[PDB]
């Protein structure tokens, strides 16, 4: 007999925004092989020279005075830096606002401004590879300044506001393919810049309604392609930083299946050579091409094509110091059960006669990314799910014929399993972060000794908070269906008892090409609810989850809805067969694409066990893929315009007809830029036709990602305050 | 052993939309001294005479096969019939559609057409007063045809789509002040037409979002002058039906405080002289003016003004056949409690030295509208509130010094005790209709014998249905605060039991010049919920409502909402003393302006007696009157643009701040043009900042007047479903 009270306060709503839980990552980047940038720890920014415990104050409590410049970065000369803050701060991935130049010693603000124009907003500044040369993007125009005090030079200015995007990515590139906003890349020599110019005039335009703006609010118009519409028309240009600065346009290939090209990847192969990944409009035919920036001569080095589509076309080709044989990562057949994503080798100049396909790694697992390759001998470092899909571990292999894989850390202090590392220019030291399943562990390590030769950032306060609050028990119960094994992640409220029945939630994302069951450390509304309300949560990554086989990924190609619905529902079936789960209170949640799923999965099982969930909800739930971005629609459903009959069954209406007793809900901001309000509007219309019971909460004229702490706090509060009633008996 | 069965079934929403409760009112109109239209009640169109039960079917039941024309009007010569079908209403009265002309007996339907154009949608056609002459308004252009066989001829075409209106009303001149879409007047002889030209060029424009139209739904722009904006430029023009049809325009007076004006009332004095009412922008000066058509010159007749505002702007004076003294209705002091609305005599040509004002009526009551004046006698027939403000009865005063208002209707029927009458050209024969609280009756009568020859429509189905189900018993309970009187209405399902407790739902409308506590028979969601769900619903006409004193109207100048809030909370506190009613379950409802009330009456009384309303709700509420039409904001809260500071204290936002835990609902269609959705969006923003629980529903791209049955039943089902789980414990 024992009691074991363990009376510690349950996690409240504010805990996610409590400074104790305010996880800090310096996000160090190797300035050289002997030191890293060592950004803000708790204020001043030092330069912790990794050689021998030496820290030099490069930045001090001075950016606090400069109107709280959110972002900061120092030029390669380490002598003049740029600070940047925001006025009317919009950054979902936008990152606009004010830029300022400043001095390395201290103080000295300097408004980096467009020529002939005073202090004004700037899109992006960045740094060059050499000395203090910088650029800045004003109203879709790239201007360059080799010297900090040098008068601005209009390198290119033909870009137009919302019409021509050169030096920055438009919304489709900012959200669907590049997933990054910067569309310029410096050459290795710091003399040339390769950028992308996008014409958007032919692109169809939508207008987001506005209410809260003014007494006569007007719609914000911008281009937003859809299925069967006109995609942005991109071109690739190269312009020098000095002298003539000639613009050179690179010719894409003219294959019969190469109708329209997406620039999924472009990188300087050398100071004059460049490697570009060009994908067909159907997103099922990719071509890796090697071109010459100063010459413009293009020649293909590889080509791949898949029946369904190509995944992770954002490959990063890591090159040698002189354009010698380099590395790549791609899907090799790997026999049965999916052409797994493994590493591959390319020679310096692969002849058109044959390819250099050389799987450095082989096995039923995938490499998430290639970390780095260093030329003294044979060392490729990378992150992979080799040990387990739900974990990202560090691995190293050798480029010489031995091809021997090797772990580096394989667990460290306080239960760390998840890994993510980053090497320097010359292997001298590499950073490593845990971010799971414990507190993130910012650390330095040395390639030879492989030892933590000083603690970088541990966040002991986070451990104190996690031991001072009822952090819910983490559990795993891998499931298996048909010809695949599906991960899972059930949670228990740390006061659980097998005798006491407890309610259940299913959290679903199911994004095609991503994963939800990961050992990354995270605290969100689910953690609070399992703490504040004590309901188990289920995270099942059904068919189409990433890093689990290309065949599994393509299982849902043009077959959305049903398969993932089957997986999530069968996860619910598996959870109900226990004695600690009461059928009275079982709920679901979703968001973004998962919102779709969060709506698609409310049918009746059998006849006695109908109305599978008492309550459900969604957030920004995509419902019609015709009304969503073309780069996404055509990817998983093919090109429109020819009536492919791949959209009628995709509409969630077909499933929402029943809605017998489920207490549904929708939360959707008015001014959503990713998933338009039209999706919620159509769903509500269909619901009205079906005459169902639901409630709606709205955010008037707000962005999609909730980049305001008040917005996120209110959102999590609303979700909790919604599940409380339907989980109360 | 067998007692068989008893008891009658209660009332459910399905009953409302069953055919049983439909009030098939024919709405007959006195064509001549001894005949009325006797329009459709259960099919065919039949003409009747008062002499001896004369039956004359003019049109068969062919409207069903005539594409189910929504409306029809016979030609004034009783020779042609105009059918209106395929109507797509946009406002309350903008029934744009298709018009087809046909011969009186039957056969040969002919589609009215614009010149040189085939069948197309028509804004309005109408009929003339004599012969077969007609007009029609197409794309804001008035064309006329004296001869039906004669094709369309151009008459006036200055109109522009949404900018220039000829003979019709814009939104402001349809819904706020003129309260109808009729802006054209036929001369008694059918020789000239008087039409209003509305210029919207300087009127600001607002877009209403569309969320359902197509792949890229676009906003709808229309001219909605907000508070502190420029009202449309209205001019009056008289045109001839023959010859050159040279236009002549009316010249308004030029008092220094009436430059910006509304033509709030204009009625033909004769076939060439007219009386027109100009109400200035501050609506504090209303000049009645006599104009001659052939010269275009307007001669001033009289002026009216008040310490707060003018009222009853569309009471058309009745001009005698000789143009002698017309008996208009103006605010005479009538002792205390403000200047009651009593009849004023005005001679044909009153001397400028002194007018011929004469208070025909008198008493602690007023006249709602004046039917006619028997030129062959000292009899003037009208409808007035002589008995009670909540009942209207027919009366006949003496235009000469007799001044005897006779007891004609005056409770001549046992049940309704509430009346509405309409006389002929000779006023010998008149139609009478009860319209509550009993089942409405339509009856013929003569003013000589005051005898009921036969009932025109008895609503037999309505009577049997009102006897079928357990009706809610009607009750009344006057209240008084200070020197103000306020009626009240309350219902019970008539199967009330004192032991069982029932909750209270408070319904408010509260708009100036209205009467929520009325003895009108009606079937709605209120009685359905009272019957089936067992609740008692209270209506209390607070301060600011009309028909009970010009002072009791005008005291709310710039203080619109607070006084009626005090009246309603007094009603709550003085009604919750019942031993069969409880403080736990108290709920409120609101609509349009009442939504503000439904939100403005939820504080926490003191500190202990909080939780005033358990589950409140509202429809299209208004919180910031700046975002609303100037003709309502300025008219009661003071003119906008001057920062009256009533536009910063009449916001319920600071009032809805507390709302600590009370659940609340909002319902608002997307395409609302009564109270723009911006009000709801701002309210939601405040609530998110206020951090209070709320719910919401949406109707995408739906007008405010609920022009469909399915939408109406969905709304009623949704509101009753909201209330049913918010009452039961």
Numbering used by the authors:
A (entry chain I), B (entry chain J): 59 to 787
Text lifted from the article:
Here we report cryo-electron microscopy structures of the Kv4.2–DPP6S–KChIP1 dodecamer complex, the Kv4.2–KChIP1 and Kv4.2–DPP6S octamer complexes, and Kv4.2 alone. Thus, our data suggest that two distinct modes of modulation contribute in an additive manner to evoke A-type currents from the native Kv4 macromolecular complex.
The dimeric crystal structure of the DPP6S extracellular domain43 was used as a guide to construct the atomic models of the Kv4.2–DPP6S and Kv4.2–DPP6S–KChIP1 structures. In the extracellular region, two DPP6S dimers float above the channel core.
